[PDB]
Amino acid sequence: MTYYRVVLIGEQGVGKSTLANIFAGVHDSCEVLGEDTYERTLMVDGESATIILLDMWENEWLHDHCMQVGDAYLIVYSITDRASFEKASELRIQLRRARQTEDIPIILVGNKSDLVRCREVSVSEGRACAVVFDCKFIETSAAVQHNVKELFEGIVRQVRLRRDSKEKNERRLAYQKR
Amino acid sequence: EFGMTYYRVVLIGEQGVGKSTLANIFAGVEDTYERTLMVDGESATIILLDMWENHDHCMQVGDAYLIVYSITDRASFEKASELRIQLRRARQTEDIPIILVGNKSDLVRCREVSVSEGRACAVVFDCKFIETSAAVQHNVKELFEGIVRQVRLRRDSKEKNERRLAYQKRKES
Numbered sequence: 427m428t429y430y431r432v433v434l435i436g437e438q439g440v441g442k443s444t445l446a447n448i449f450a451g452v453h454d455s456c457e458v459l460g461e462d463t464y465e466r467t468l469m470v471d472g473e474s475a476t477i478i479l480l481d482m483w484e485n486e487w488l489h490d491h492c493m494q495v496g497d498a499y500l501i502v503y504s505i506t507d508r509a510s511f512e513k514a515s516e517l518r519i520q521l522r523r524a525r526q527t528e529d530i531p532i533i534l535v536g537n538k539s540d541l542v543r544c545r546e547v548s549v550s551e552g553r554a555c556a557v558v559f560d561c562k563f564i565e566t567s568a569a570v571q572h573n574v575k576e577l578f579e580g581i582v583r584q585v586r587l588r589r590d591s592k593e594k595n596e597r598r599l600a601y602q603k604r
Numbered sequence: 605e606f607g608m609t610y611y612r613v614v615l616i617g618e619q620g621v622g623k624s625t626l627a628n629i630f631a632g633v634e635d636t637y638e639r640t641l642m643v644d645g646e647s648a649t650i651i652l653l654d655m656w657e658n659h660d661h662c663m664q665v666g667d668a669y670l671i672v673y674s675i676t677d678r679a680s681f682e683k684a685s686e687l688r689i690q691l692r693r694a695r696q697t698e699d700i701p702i703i704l705v706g707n708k709s710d711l712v713r714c715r716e717v718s719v720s721e722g723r724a725c726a727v728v729f730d731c732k733f734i735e736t737s738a739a740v741q742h743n744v745k746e747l748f749e750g751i752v753r754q755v756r757l758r759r760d761s762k763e764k765n766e767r768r769l770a771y772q773k774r775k776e777s
């Protein structure tokens with residue numbers, strides 16, 4: 427068993443809990459930690475990955491220490507809410523301040539991709555933020571299950587790139603391509 | 605890129621043909637809409653531009669073009685035909701995906717341009733052809749799926765496109 431501690435942060439209402447629950451619902455199977463922690467094991471590039479998913483950003487002990495426990499952070503905004511996109515920047519700064527020495531894997535997540543007509547953040551703008559500030563970008567929908575699978579496979583791959591040798595990840599990339 | 609593949613699709617054609625009404629269906633219902641859809645089992649993020657005014661730069665921005673006329677208006681059919689050539693001329697080093705779109709197919713008693721004529725001209729023009737009704741939603745889904753396939757044919761390896769055609773043939777049959 428290899429653990430991947432993944433933390434959801436972002437403005438209230440962007441879909442963190444809905445993403446978490448969709449992830450938990452799709453995959454079969456740390457209950458003592460409480461109702462905001464989800465554990466599921468995935469197969470990624472022919473190797474098991476046990477994701478511990480932490481969703482306690484909203485205003486008990488784990489909540490006050492959210493920035494310190496993760497191997498990887500999902501900074502979520504809603505594509506329909508400019509304010510949440512700005513909040514994601516506040517969070518990026520707060521997080522890289524708390525973990526100054528570490529190349530912490532971050533995914534910027536533009537959630538609610540199904541709400542096409544209410545879009546306030548262009549995919550180009552989300553992409554540009556990720557490029558300039560050095561993280562990965564993906565648009566998702568918990569409502570429609572767009573890229574939910576891809577998000578969690580992606581975060582595993584990103585953590586593995588930081589942890590493991592160029593050889594190991596070389597075989598895994600060759601596994602993924604073929 | 606990571607979990608995202610982008611397709612810039614531009615709607616062009618005469619005023620009143622139904623460019624915006626098609627864009628509205630795409631949106632779910634303002635210059636631009638952005639939606640990810642699945643085609644042949646693979647997600648495709650379409651950036652749909654609906655800002656054509658009746659120039660040269662608009663001919664350069666797109667990965668692909670939807671040239672729309674109304675089946676009730678012969679003048680719009682001729683302009684669409686003109687735009688097709690202009691676009692080919694504007695992008696000389698490239699084979700740009702184009703669909704010629706005969707919109708308003710619900711208005712049977714008002715039609716001026718026949719289905720055969722549209723098909724025939726499209727063969728002559730070497731482009732794809734489809735008739736749509738934006739009012740009643742017919743072939744609109746097929747239109748946006750079709751433009752994605754078109755871009756993939758130019759962009760991706762011939763093995764990848766072989767897999768997609770097989771996937772597609774199984775779904776339809």
Ligand SMILES: Nc1nc2c(ncn2[C@@H]2O[C@H](COP(=O)(O)OP(=O)(O)O)[C@@H](O)[C@H]2O)c(=O)[nH]1
Nearest residue numbers: 438439440441442443444537538539567568569
């Ligand atoms: N349309 C749509 N609604 C969503 C999506 N994700 C979450 N929601 C809705 O957004 C609201 C807030 O979601 P929630 O998970 O509680 O947000 P949180 O505060 O970040 O944990 C709820 O009504 C959800 O049903 C999505 O991808 N699309």
Ligand SMILES: Nc1nc2c(ncn2[C@@H]2O[C@H](COP(=O)(O)OP(=O)(O)O)[C@@H](O)[C@H]2O)c(=O)[nH]1
Nearest residue numbers: 618619620621622623624625707708737738739
């Ligand atoms: N009957 C019918 N009317 C349509 C169709 N598409 C558009 N229209 C109508 O044609 C008018 C012009 O459409 P619009 O989208 O504004 O054309 P545009 O100038 O090319 O963007 C509107 O009043 C629509 O209701 C269609 O498929 N069938």
Ligand SMILES: [Mg+2]
Nearest residue numbers: 442443444484
């Ligand atoms: Mg929540």
Ligand SMILES: [Mg+2]
Nearest residue numbers: 620623624625
């Ligand atoms: Mg219009």
